[PDB]
Amino acid sequence: YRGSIRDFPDFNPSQDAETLYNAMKGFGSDKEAIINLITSRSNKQRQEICQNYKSLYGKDLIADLKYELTGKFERLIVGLMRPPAYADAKEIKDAISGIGTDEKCLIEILASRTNEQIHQLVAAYKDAYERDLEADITGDTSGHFRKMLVVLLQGTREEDDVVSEDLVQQDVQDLYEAGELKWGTDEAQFIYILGNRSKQHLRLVFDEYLKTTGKPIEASIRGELSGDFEKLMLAVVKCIRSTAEYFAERLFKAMKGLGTRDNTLIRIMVSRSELDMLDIREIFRTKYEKSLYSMIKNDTSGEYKKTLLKLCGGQFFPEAAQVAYQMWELSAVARVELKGTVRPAGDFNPDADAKALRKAMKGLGTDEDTIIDIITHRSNAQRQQIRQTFKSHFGRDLMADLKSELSGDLARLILGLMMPPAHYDAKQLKKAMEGAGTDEKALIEILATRTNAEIQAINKAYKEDYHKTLEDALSSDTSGHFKRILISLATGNREEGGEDRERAREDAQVAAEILTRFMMILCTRSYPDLRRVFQEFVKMTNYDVEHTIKKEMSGDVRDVFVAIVQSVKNKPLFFADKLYKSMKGAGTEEKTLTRIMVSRSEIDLLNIRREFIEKYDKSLHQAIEGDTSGHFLKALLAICGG
Ligand SMILES: [Ca+2]
Ligand SMILES: [Ca+2]
Ligand SMILES: [Ca+2]
Ligand SMILES: [Ca+2]
Numbered sequence: 001y002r003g004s005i006r007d008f009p010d011f012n013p014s015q016d017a018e019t020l021y022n023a024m025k026g027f028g029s030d031k032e033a034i035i036n037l038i039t040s041r042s043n044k045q046r047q048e049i050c051q052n053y054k055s056l057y058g059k060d061l062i063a064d065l066k067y068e069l070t071g072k073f074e075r076l077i078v079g080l081m082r083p084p085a086y087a088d089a090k091e092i093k094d095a096i097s098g099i100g101t102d103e104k105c106l107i108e109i110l111a112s113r114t115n116e117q118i119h120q121l122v123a124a125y126k127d128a129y130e131r132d133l134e135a136d137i138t139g140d141t142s143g144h145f146r147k148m149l150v151v152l153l154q155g156t157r158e159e160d161d162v163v164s165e166d167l168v169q170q171d172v173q174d175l176y177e178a179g180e181l182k183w184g185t186d187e188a189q190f191i192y193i194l195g196n197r198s199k200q201h202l203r204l205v206f207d208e209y210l211k212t213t214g215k216p217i218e219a220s221i222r223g224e225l226s227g228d229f230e231k232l233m234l235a236v237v238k239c240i241r242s243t244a245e246y247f248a249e250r251l252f253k254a255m256k257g258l259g260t261r262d263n264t265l266i267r268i269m270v271s272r273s274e275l276d277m278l279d280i281r282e283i284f285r286t287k288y289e290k291s292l293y294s295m296i297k298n299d300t301s302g303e304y305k306k307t308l309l310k311l312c313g314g315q316f317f318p319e320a321a322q323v324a325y326q327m328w329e330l331s332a333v334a335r336v337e338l339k340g341t342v343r344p345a346g347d348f349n350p351d352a353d354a355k356a357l358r359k360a361m362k363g364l365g366t367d368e369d370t371i372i373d374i375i376t377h378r379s380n381a382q383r384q385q386i387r388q389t390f391k392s393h394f395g396r397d398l399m400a401d402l403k404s405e406l407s408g409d410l411a412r413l414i415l416g417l418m419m420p421p422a423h424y425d426a427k428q429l430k431k432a433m434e435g436a437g438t439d440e441k442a443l444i445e446i447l448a449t450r451t452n453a454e455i456q457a458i459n460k461a462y463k464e465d466y467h468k469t470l471e472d473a474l475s476s477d478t479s480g481h482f483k484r485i486l487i488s489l490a491t492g493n494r495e496e497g498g499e500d501r502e503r504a505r506e507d508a509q510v511a512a513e514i515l516t517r518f519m520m521i522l523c524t525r526s527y528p529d530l531r532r533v534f535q536e537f538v539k540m541t542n543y544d545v546e547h548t549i550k551k552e553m554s555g556d557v558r559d560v561f562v563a564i565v566q567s568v569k570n571k572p573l574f575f576a577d578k579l580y581k582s583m584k585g586a587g588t589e590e591k592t593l594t595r596i597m598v599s600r601s602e603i604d605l606l607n608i609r610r611e612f613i614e615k616y617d618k619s620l621h622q623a624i625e626g627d628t629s630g631h632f633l634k635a636l637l638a639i640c641g642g
């Protein structure tokens, strides 16, 4: 049983109805009792209770509840009383009935519900409202989106059976040609296959597609479709692979950033409470920093929160384990292409650049707009050229002039862009260790993200600018395991070769025991090897490395390793995650925000931009646009590149 709420052992329906009656007795009601009851009984038992109540009093429990309660807390409780099928119908009703139209709800339900659930859905709609669901849907949606929805409404998807490897491969190429190989996508094609083929078949098709293409099916869909259809087709895929994972992220999305999408939270927590709530939790914790319980506890309040925490629940299983494993498989096989946001300027004229720069700095005030239009629109290399030119033209150091004429975050941003990669990092590391305390966050981000070549370049740039070895510096500002671990990474001496299934299983065993060598493995093994090592870990312990690190490590030590693991799993994502935090909350960390924007502006910033929008449903553009302002915002948005 992967549900969070199960049948209450030895339950007295008649008494429960009596307790519900007495709970609402007098002015108001004993909400603490109502929630503890309803939330401690299966939807089936709730139906019996609601039944005994109708006879024992001749009143409607749901109608009565609707009166004695109010607010989100009411929607939740009343929603928990409605039969599964009739609950879905209500959600759909609200979505297509009113002012706007919740396509998010339409997609969540229609793309996840099974053939039976779908049939029980449309039936409950016609019964509860005496209206045709297909007609209502068809008349409230347009385009391929409407089509796909109607196809999903038929609930006539071929159900699991023996897979025909011949048809699987035929579908793999069919999809490939209908999408990846073309400018756009054959909607009619994807709708038919992704909508008719069995989940078991498609799952094997998706696996085949990645192994023979290099990228997951969604990678070929993303950006190749438009509007709600893209989202819908991306949701169907996710659901086919794992509905637990779908709701896992769908949930995270409803609580992400100030303000909650309570309507989605209640719908999901209620609908999956007796299906895969447990797996969703196992996946949520693994896929995200905070646990479902923690996220809900911090986003909701009152009885509404207490109820949600009860619905939630608070080793892996066939599902939660599959996802974790497949997560590493993808990261290991996926053929990703790193792309920056700022590219070399065409018709590059250093002489004209240095002139415009010199001009925009003369006088009392400093023309910053021009300074930004140039600097932020030139590759770090071209920038180094403007420095050379500027100097060999005016006999003055551009940096010194820039540093003096500029100030604040802007000065830090602009001057940061003018510094060569290896030197910017060196400066960063030096600052993190200067003064009182250590910017543990800065050191980790860098030392746990940079490569052997990058670390080598850094180690050198450091000795120069700051006559002292990067190690010596580290030993001066840090200590303990944090220092040992950091110093290790600062050696840029990690294995480069491919994976070794032999050593892998061995290394994996080391991680299993912990639940010095571990450090060596996480600091010495090549990323491709570690990727496999983690594959073997989930296969022999049933847990994910992240869980071993969290359970046996804490604080900085735990953050360096998690940073490393994340860097090996999905570097761009790790940065998108860090970029979100910097702008998360009332304040803003222009420091981290600036460091990441600059450092990755020419490596994989575009990649980060996508991982950001996909996971937080909002472009980095708007993300920055809302936090920063003035000239700091102008320059930043320049690096973002759209
Ligand atoms: Ca009310
Ligand atoms: Ca395509
Ligand atoms: Ca929130
Ligand atoms: Ca000036």
Ligand SMILES: [Ca+2]
Residues within 6 Å of the ligand: 432, 433, 434, 435, 436, 437, 438, 477
């Ligand atoms: Ca310090």
Ligand SMILES: [Ca+2]
Residues within 6 Å of the ligand: 582, 583, 584, 585, 586, 587, 588, 627
């Ligand atoms: Ca902020």
